[PDB]
Design a protein around this ligand. Sequence first.
Ligand code: HEO
Ligand code: HEM
Ligand SMILES: [Cu+2]
Lengths: 260, 260, 658, 96, 96, 184, 184
Amino acid sequence: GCNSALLDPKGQIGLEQRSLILTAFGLMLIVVIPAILMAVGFAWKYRASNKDAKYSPNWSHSNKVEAVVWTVPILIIIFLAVLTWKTTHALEPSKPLAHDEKPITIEVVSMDWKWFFIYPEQGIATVNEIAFPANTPVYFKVTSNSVMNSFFIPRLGSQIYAMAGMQTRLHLIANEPGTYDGISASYSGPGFSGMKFKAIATPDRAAFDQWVAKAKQSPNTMSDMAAFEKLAAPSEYNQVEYFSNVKPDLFADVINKFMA
Amino acid sequence: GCNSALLDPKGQIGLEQRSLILTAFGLMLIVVIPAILMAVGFAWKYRASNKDAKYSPNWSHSNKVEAVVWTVPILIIIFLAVLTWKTTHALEPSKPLAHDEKPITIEVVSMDWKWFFIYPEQGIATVNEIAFPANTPVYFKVTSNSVMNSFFIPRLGSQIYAMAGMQTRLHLIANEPGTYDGISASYSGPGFSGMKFKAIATPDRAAFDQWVAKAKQSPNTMSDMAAFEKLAAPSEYNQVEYFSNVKPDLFADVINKFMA
Amino acid sequence: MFGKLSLDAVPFHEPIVMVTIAGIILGGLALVGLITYFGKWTYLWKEWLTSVDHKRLGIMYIIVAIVMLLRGFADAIMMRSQQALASAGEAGFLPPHHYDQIFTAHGVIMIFFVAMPFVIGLMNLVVPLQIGARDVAFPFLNNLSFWFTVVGVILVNVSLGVGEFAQTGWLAYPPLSGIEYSPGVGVDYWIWSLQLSGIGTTLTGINFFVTILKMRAPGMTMFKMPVFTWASLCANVLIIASFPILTVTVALLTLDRYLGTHFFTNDMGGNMMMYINLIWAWGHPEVYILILPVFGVFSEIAATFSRKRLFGYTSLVWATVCITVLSFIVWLHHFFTMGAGANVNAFFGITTMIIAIPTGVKIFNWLFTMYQGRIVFHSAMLWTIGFIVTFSVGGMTGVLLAVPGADFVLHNSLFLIAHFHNVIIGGVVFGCFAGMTYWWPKAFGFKLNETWGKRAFWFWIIGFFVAFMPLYALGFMGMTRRLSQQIDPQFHTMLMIAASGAVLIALGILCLVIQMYVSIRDRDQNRDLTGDPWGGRTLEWATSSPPPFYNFAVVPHVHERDAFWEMKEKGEAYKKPDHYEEIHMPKNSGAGIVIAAFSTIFGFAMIWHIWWLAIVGFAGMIITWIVKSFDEDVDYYVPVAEIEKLENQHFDEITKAG
Amino acid sequence: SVKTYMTGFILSIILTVIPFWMVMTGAASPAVILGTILAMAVVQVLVHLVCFLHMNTKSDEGWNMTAFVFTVLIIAILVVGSIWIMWNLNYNMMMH
Amino acid sequence: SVKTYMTGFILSIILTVIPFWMVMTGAASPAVILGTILAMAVVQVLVHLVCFLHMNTKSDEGWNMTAFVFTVLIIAILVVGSIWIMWNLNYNMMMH
Amino acid sequence: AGGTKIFGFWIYLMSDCILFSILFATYAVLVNGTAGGPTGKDIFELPFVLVETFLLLFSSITYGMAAIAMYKNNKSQVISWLALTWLFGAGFIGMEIYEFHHLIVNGMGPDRSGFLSAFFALVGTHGLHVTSGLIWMAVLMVQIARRGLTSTNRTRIMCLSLFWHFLDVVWICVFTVVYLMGAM
Amino acid sequence: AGGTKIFGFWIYLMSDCILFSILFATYAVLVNGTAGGPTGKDIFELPFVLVETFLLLFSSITYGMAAIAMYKNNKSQVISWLALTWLFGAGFIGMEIYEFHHLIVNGMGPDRSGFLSAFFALVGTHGLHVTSGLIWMAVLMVQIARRGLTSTNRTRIMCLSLFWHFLDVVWICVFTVVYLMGAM
Ligand code: HEO
Ligand code: HEM
Ligand SMILES: [Cu+2]
């Protein structure tokens, strides 16, 4: 798809990943296309029906042919492996982005069949929605309250796992303001289909502050583990929710629940 | 030698290096000693003169013997290679020492058949002598004004090369105050034997300040490249010299002489 | 007559060099006088000086190596005496200007013109005989290689006579050996000597590599060859894959010295470190070239004198192949103190440690070859036992030195010299003497005196221990290499002990000379009648003790590992063939010595900047090569009559002796 | 035959023309302009060896090829080793 | 024979007694007390295989040994791989 | 015929080597797993493990003597040596069961921590292996008593030799990695 | 007989491969060596290198046609093809000498910088190799004219074929690494 999520990304990491996919595709084509072409060519040209076709029922080894067969795959794998090493060392989710703007910290707790997000610096909490200004690095600290999940925003870039009692780091920056879809890429149970959220890349900071202020006006507060556990009850297709007051160290307590 | 320079060191780096030498010696003995013992044993016991000795003129292969022969060297090399990796990554001269006291920077320019030292922080210069307080890290920035040399203080620890237009880093700490000998470990020409200096590990800081003040009282000054070049004249068995006033960036100018 | 050459190029004032020159020139004049008096000029010219034959070129390599060993050991004695006198707070008798020349020349001679000539001599002597071939693939190439080695030797010796030698160590590190810091002509002597010797050695490597694979006796598969042939093949592979690195490195240094380029200069963006890397990229394979064949020799001896089949043939051949493969990825272990990253130092340390396993496997295979055999205490067997005992300690110290932590204080210290001298004396020269005494009957037809041989071996081993064990302690005490004047008195005692060791080794060398003399004197009583003196396993012992210029009248058929042992066991060892056939052989060629003389002139002119003479020499070389490329009468046919006569004489000797 | 030599000649013309034209015009990113020319060079290296190069006996078809393969491994050791060692040795002597 | 079994038994007694006595008394540095017991264990592993173990035919002396060698390489892959991967995966999830 | 069966059992033992290596890796990862519970140093009694090791080694030596006696074509000697080997194995299993019972009763069972679970898994797997060997010895002895030393019986004795010596090697690795290294 | 000589020359070419690889490594290290001097981009004329490459490729093809003609047992055809190959080689050497003369006269010789020294070394080594090939062609042609197509002559032609094609491969590597990559 020309207008696909991965082939038309909006995040930087998405852009380098798309470039890498296209370069890899190009490198593999140079060997794959001849294989299929020669398959069809040798099937048609050298059929039993043809009389003019050269018949060689004792030509069973060729040093030239074997050398050509071995060499080209080796060279293609060498080039693509050098590219793989460079990109893998340059696209590690556990690596801070190089940008002037200070990164915004978001904590992602993965409850059963819903998504929970905490802004500790802003001191707010959300369910099935996030917001961050465009052209600003975003630092995700992702953990699971329960069964393994996978935090993923296809348009922005790379995914990661959420596991109980383990913090995993991720970095994402949005080049174009707008609304992007976010899903879970690891089957967590019956309500796994339910896990869906929206990432709002605001055109400017002021819109982000307005969204934070709107979240601050929520009557609901997340100040104690009892309220967290009450929210953590098994539920399906949870609507977008807001919480004004957040415990200073909630992510730490969620991880320490499993003593890790 | 029990009272040898390397087997009775005074520096820390010397101590870990001696420990490593002894551990390696021990590991290699377990295989080497049996080789020589079996050589002498099989030479004596199975000589042509003996009649009771078992004669096997067709026993030419043994799976058990071959397995034993291959295995033990492999295991010894595996253990000593793990030790080698750990020590090599832990004894790199280009690595700052872990200690409370701030390291003292010494610049080591290697003139033809003599040693030159600069204290930039103290702003003094010396020929064929250094001083530093005991139990204090010392950071050597070593270069050669001419032909390759090798900065080396056997008792303190590791050596390094001095090459034209290249700065090389080294770290040394002295556990016991006293006078230690320092030589060149790379043949630089006829006057190579001449290259000899003394490292004075003072019992306390106050003695080091007294030595620095004594060096400050030298009538001679090293303020320009002309004076440096005048000193850099080919000379042999140069006596200990002092220089009060030093150009702020002399080491930089010495390296930039070769445009590197 | 032109260039830097003048009356001031010869050192009139210095007495030591003048008395050395007088000794050499009177020796040469006496030898020429004796040859003229006996009138053997013609015999040497047609049978020795210009012989394609492999055995003659092998014996002549042995002669060159032996005569150069005397000069090398004289330099060793002079250095040890100078160090001993300097330690006692005396000025000594060798100025640094002479000491530097002496140690550089000693290193170069003892590496390039003592070890390699002797080893390649042994290869030329036995490898063609063992594989069951009549000659080598390229006989004229072998003759040319010999003469190129002789040219290198001549240039090194004449360096003493006129001008000076290099004062930059035996490898000539760039910044000291540059035109800025070494204005002398010594480095040019070093350059051209090593260049021509390297060309010769590369040609030798190619020749042997082709000979071993292509000219094997029919029915002898790769895994049925004697172990020495395997070791020789591995060494020649190393020569082919290594010596180009030396050629290119020396060519780059001589370009820097002549055309004023900036390859290794400290200024104008030259990278000096590069040279060191390149030379050591060549440096470390070289030592295995010295140690692989001698291993084979010991294996052969271990087979012959234990009176039982060699243990772990497959293990030995796989171990030598592993050594050959691993000897290209370990060179950086020479300069851990250069200041490379922890990763690179650790990796190169580990890979240098890995190559220890195959050598240990080979030593254990020899030990288990001696396990339940009947061991005869011959000279060769004593050399083998001494080699095992010494080389174990050498290898121990080596693997200790291979750790970067230990190398950070033991590098360029007398511990390193103790290591390399220990392993060289343990393996190379021990295998050299063992092979010389083991293959002497196949070269001349008589045996060596056993008493003098045993005396020489005992003197060598005891002297080596006494001379080099104190160097371990001195290395530990922090005394570095190449010290000449005002040596720290604390190093006196050990050095004095080393001096004692030196004179002990001297007696050994003297013993060796005496041995050869008496072996020549009493040849009529110690003749090898049967052609099988020690009951050797390999095909080489099937022939008469003087082998005919054709190795075999009929090329032998091989079915098993030890061909000659199986032939003796089956009871068909000396059977008269039904009929003999005309044998195709190569003619003796005189162009090798002409090309050698032209190369000597070219090299000498290049050293002394005589441009026209160098052009004349190079043109002479190319013209001689082109002219010899024209003639087609290079081979002849040995008739049935001569072959039948020699075979009948040999069989009569067998019958009378048997 | 003449056919294989002509085929090699045509492939050599193509694999020489394309890199030259690509470099002189800057028709792509420098990374691509490096990777593709190296690929075409090694293919073009193989092209000359596959077509123009021909052995007479063909007798050691196993052997001659084994010699060629070994000659490569040594080059891949020496060149890569030298480049890596000098990169590290130059990075560790910069005025920092 | 009985001789090889008795020799194996004696070597096994020594290579079991020494590590136990060394650990219970803390007679050295912990690094040495680990390295030496691992060395003695693998030697002692080899001891039991060299002496007690015997294959009746001895027919595939090349083969059965090749099977044993391969069974090791796979273990050296799996165990070392698992330990390394889990070390990295535990270092990357610590609260830092 | 015996050759193929012995080679097959050898390949099964190599499969079992892989099986035990996986448990070793699992234990190595979960060695520090225990949280607010007993550690290696707190529960491992070294004398008990030393007695276990010596009795299993005595079992191996006695079975070796049984194999030698079978090569000597004697029935009574093989029966006696097999009985002594089975007695040593029964003693070893008894001590292992006693240790497990003591751990479980004291509230230190496999449900307490990751470390205890991994320890129980590895030592338990070895225990079931040894008890399978003991049942095999029982059936082999009752077969020998009523059939004599036949080709099938010789093949079974060789297979059980390979199995028992393999178990002793695995126990050497177990006490080196789990017991001795833990108590360090 | 011819087989051994051809195999020997092949091993010599492998030695020469090592020889050229060392020069390639030296050039790669000293590619940025130049200080206050001309760089790759400043002096490398790509059309000149393209003309050099095409003329050396024409030399290789003509020599190949000479080898085919020798297989066809014709003397005149081999002489004509060898003459055309030698003419192409002479043209290539002429252009290389002209380039070196232009560089030296303009004060950009091998004594100016490390980069220029390495460039001169590599291209010069290739030049001496090609001129050695040209002298070999001259002696081989004058031998053919007076001796005819003998076994020795056929062996020499095969050896020179291996040498010339090897030189063309080395030149491909040279223009890829030095000229084309430098001017990028
Ligand atoms: C015969 C000559 C020769 C040979 C074959 C060797 C081979 C070896 N060299 Fe010695 N070298 C030799 C002569 C020199 N080496 C040198 C350089 C040199 C250096 C670098 C110098 C430095 O760091 O300053 C090291 C570390 C060693 C160690 C070894 C090792 C480990 C081997 C190994 O490849 C072989 C060692 C043998 C062993 C290991 C057998 C003993 C083992 C047994 C019985 C099994 C026991 C099991 C174990 C130890 C695991 N060599 C130099 C350069 C000097 C200069 O700088 O100018 C020379 C001349
Ligand atoms: C026969 C007894 C030998 C003695 C007594 C001897 C003695 C010495 C001595 C004293 C040095 C100088 C070490 C120093 O710098 O203090 C030296 C250097 C050297 N020797 Fe020997 N040597 C002997 C044999 C050999 C042999 C057979 C070889 C080579 C195969 C050899 C190769 C060298 C080398 C390469 C050097 C280093 C030269 C340098 O530093 O530039 N030696 N030898
Ligand atoms: Cu080395």
